């Protein structure tokens, strides 16, 4: 709730300098927080803020830079997957941490990723994930940049599965990957189907799903869900949550410490 | 001109990133294309390739948003001038065109700019005919963000007379072109009977790319209203007619094509 409000201020400042608009964003956000952070609430708040700002994608540039760095280093990430003793687990780790990397940069990322692999998963259900990947799999993405790293795990999954369906956001909201991000990363060449969550909610809002996507989720033999908002919406089974616990609330919910990497299957 | 394109590629890239490798890659690939083969197809192909290299979906997202914001702020004043004029239809045409050109207290300044452009009037003035054809099925082919707010004033005038009104925007972001979100922000979806896209988001119109619904609506139209220079350049060799081109002739090639001088405003019907 606090972070959200800071994030509203940040977004507004990405778009505009009009203090009237910026304060209108923050003030209208305060009003909504006071009346009712949930996925439905954060979504409702960002949408209202974008409406006040008259913007479609305030994070357009910030997402592009994440895509750019991901593109630069992905061949190296592949090297580490292909070269590891357990490619599937290493692909999981890469999908979780690749976009956590801090801004040549190619050498630094090699160190970062090798360090995260040494630390490993605090919760490591990757063998079970691998097992369940033989069925119809739905891969629910999170951010731009990150979606480039997700392609590595999709290829691994693609070795076993009956079918792979990727889901992205139907409209830009914060740094979430949209269908264009998925095309940049060539998700449409790897996955058998590429779908949206509808009007582009943070997390999943069942009411907003297109019928094709809802069906794919219900019929899935495994859902792979990236990040915190997805976890908080979907805790539909079996589901694997791949994420870093970046906050106390999420960490306590999952049963790890902050900063821990998680690949958790709720069977 | 290809010189303006190339400069615009540099500008787009700089909007997104500071990596010189990526910037120079954008400019260099753009140069290769220009040497191999500005057409709508060509400019579309070049911006798409540049967006790919940059890993970006809308480098103009902030620039478009500011245009939307100013438009919002001064629209009520534009409305005053339309409703207060002796020929609201023609004034709505002029507003929609100068909404494609143009600060705390910028409300007073714009009053002066709009008043001036109405005094200058249209060098080609086919607005009576446009008004006459607006009784039928109408398709309104938009151009930029910001501008689309001003377009709503002409849509309302058209909406007094027409069997039907279909608005068309870009299916994906390209340069500052209005997309479906831009149209929602301007409430196009509340004025028009249908709100469609041109598909994969081309500059201008690329017939190959239109969704079936949009292609039908263009073919079945009694009148297409087309905004700006790219739309003119794609539709001017008139497979689809009657069509009205509302634009300013901002460069010598377009001006010579249409038969006006640079800076001249045009509301030209071809049929
Ligand atoms: Cl609201």
Provide, as residue numbers in chain B, all residues whose Cβ is less than 8 Å from the Cβ of A49.
none
Question: In chain B, where does the domain assigned CATH 3.40.50.10880 lie?
Answer: 123-271
Bridge partners of B179, per DSSP, are B170
Asked if residue A47 has a cis previous peptide bond (ω within 30° of 0), the answer is: no
3-state secondary structure of A120: coil
- CATH 1.10.8.380 in chain B, residue ranges: 1-57
Q: Does A51 touch chain B (CB under 8 A)?
A: yes
Dist CA B238 CA B217 (whole Å): 16
CB contact under 8 A, B55 and A61: no
Token representation of residue A10:
């940040």
Superfamily of domain A1-56: Uncharacterised protein PF01937, DUF89, domain 1 (1.10.8.380)
- The two tokens of residue B42 are 């060509």
Q: How far is CA A56 from the centre of its chain?
A: 19
Resolution (A): 2.5
Residues B208 and B200: their CA atoms lie apart, in Å, by 10
Q: Which CATH class is domain B123-271?
A: alpha beta
Task: Pick from B24, B57, B181 the residue to mutate for testing the A interface (most A CBs within 10 Å).
Answer: B57
Answer for the pair A250, A228: CB distance below 8 angstroms, yes or no. yes
For the domain made up of B1-57, give the CATH fold.
Helicase, Ruva Protein; domain 3 (1.10.8)
Question: What is the Cα–Cα distance from A259 to A239, expressed in whole angstroms?
Answer: 21
Residues 6+ apart with CB under 8 A from B105: none
Query: Which residue reads 């830009």 in tokens?
Result: A172
Angstrom CA distances, A178 to A63, A181, B209, stand at: 10, 5, 20
Among chain B residues, the shortest Cα distance to A172 is held by B57
CB B158 within 8 A of CB B225: yes
Question: Which residues of chain A does CATH 1.10.285.20 include?
Answer: 57-121
Residues of chain B contacting A20 with CB distance shorter than 8 Å: none
CA distance A203 to A205: 7
Asked if B161 and B225 count as a contact pair (C-beta separation under 8 A), the reply is no
Kindly report, as residue ranges, where domains of CATH 1.10.285.20 are found in chain B.
Answer: 58-122
Q: For CATH 3.40.50.10880, list the domain ranges present in chain A.
A: 122-267
HSE toward the beta carbon, residue B33, CA cutoff 13 A: 22
Residues B184, B186: Cα–Cα separation, whole Å:
5
Closest by CA position to B176, among listed B220, B230, B242: B230
Q: Does domain B58-122 have CATH number 1.10.285.20?
A: yes
Cα(A247) to ligand 1 centroid in Å equals 27
Of the candidates A53, A61, A181, the beta carbon closest to that of B16 is on A61
Q: Report which secondary-structure segment, H or E, holds B158.
A: helix B147-159
Q: Is A166 helix (H, G, I), strand (E, B) or coil?
A: strand
Kindly provide the residue ranges of all beta strands, DSSP E only, lying in chain B, ordered along the sequence: 124-125, 137-141, 164-169, 194-197, 223-227, 243-248, 265-270
Q: Give me the residues near ligand 1 (ion), CB cutoff below 5 Å.
A: A 48
CATH of span A122-267? 3.40.50.10880
Q: How far is A192 from chain B (nearest CA, A)?
A: 21
> In angstroms, rounded to a whole number, what is the distance separating the alpha carbons of residues A9 and A122?
34
Residue A51, both tokens: 């409406």
Alpha carbons B206 and B220: distance in angstroms, whole number: 17
Q: Can you spell out the DSSP letters for B82-108?
A: HHHSS-HHHHHHHHHHHTT----S-HH
- Nearest Cα to A244, choosing from A263, A261, A264, A219? A261
How was this structure determined? It was done by: X-ray
Give the CA radius of gyration of chain A.
Answer: 18
H helices present in chain B, as ranges: 2-16, 20-36, 40-54, 61-84, 88-98, 107-120, 127-133, 147-159, 180-185, 188-191, 212-220, 228-235, 252-258
Q: What is the DSSP letter of B179?
A: B
Distance, in Å, from the CA atom of A138 to the CA atom of A234, rounded to the nearest integer, reads: 13
| Bridge-based pairing state of the strands A239-244 and A261-266 | antiparallel
Rounded to the nearest 10°, the torsion over CA A22, A24, A28, A29 is: 10
Nearest beta carbon to residue B58 from set A54, A56, A67 = A56
Q: What is the CA radius of gyration of chain B?
A: 18
User: Does A58 contact B62 at a Cβ distance shorter than 8 Å?
Assistant: yes
By the 8 A CB rule, do A164 and A134 touch? Answer: no
Query: Which is the CATH superfamily of the domain at A57-121?
Result: Uncharacterised protein PF01937, DUF89, domain 2 (1.10.285.20)
Angle between helices A105-119 and A87-97 (to 10 degrees): 120
Question: Mutate which of B61, B67, B146, B180 to disrupt the A interface (most A C-beta within 10 Å)?
Answer: B61
CATH 1.10.8.380 range(s) for chain A read 1-56
Q: What does the alpha-carbon distance between residue B49 and residue B12 come to, in Å, rounded to a whole number?
A: 12
Tokens 């997402």 map to which residue?
Answer: A63
- Here the tokens at position B48 are 């798409």
Using CA atoms, how far apart are residues B31 and B72, in angstroms rounded to an integer? 38
């Amino acid at each position: 709730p606090s972070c959200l409000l800071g994030r509203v201020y940040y977004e507004a400042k990405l778009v505009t300098d009009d203090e009237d608009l910026i304060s209108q964003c923050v003030d209208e956000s305060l009003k909504i927080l006071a009346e009712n952070i949930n996925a439905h609430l954060a979504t409702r708040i960002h949408r209202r803020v974008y409406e006040i700002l008259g913007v479609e994608d305030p994070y357009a540039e910030v997402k592009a830079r994440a895509n750019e760095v991901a593109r630069q280093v992905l061949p190296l990430a592949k090297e580490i997957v292909e070269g590891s003793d357990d490619p599937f687990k290493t692909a999981v780790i890469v999908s979780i941490v690749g976009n956590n990397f801090d801004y040549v940069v190619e050498e630094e990322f090699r160190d970062f990723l090798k360090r995260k692999v040494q630390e490993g998963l605090k919760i490591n259900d990757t063998e079970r994930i691998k097992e369940l990947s033989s069925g119809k799999v739905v891969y629910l993405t999170d951010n731009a940049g990150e979606i480039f790293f997700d392609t590595l795990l999709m290829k691994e999954i693609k070795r076993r599965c009956e079918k792979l369906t990727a889901v992205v956001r139907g409209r830009p909201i914060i740094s979430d990957a949209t269908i264009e991000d998925a095309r940049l990363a060539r998700v449409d060449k790897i996955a058998d189907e590429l779908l949206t969550n509808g009007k582009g909610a943070i997390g999943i809002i069942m009411d907003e799903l297109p019928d094709e996507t809802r069906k794919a989720l219900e019929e899935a033999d495994l859902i792979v869900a990236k990040g915190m908002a997805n976890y908080e919406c979907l805790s539909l089974k079996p589901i694997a949550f791949l994420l870093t616990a970046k906050c106390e609330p999420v960490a306590r919910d999952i049963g790890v410490n902050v900063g821990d990497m998680v690949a958790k299957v709720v069977e």
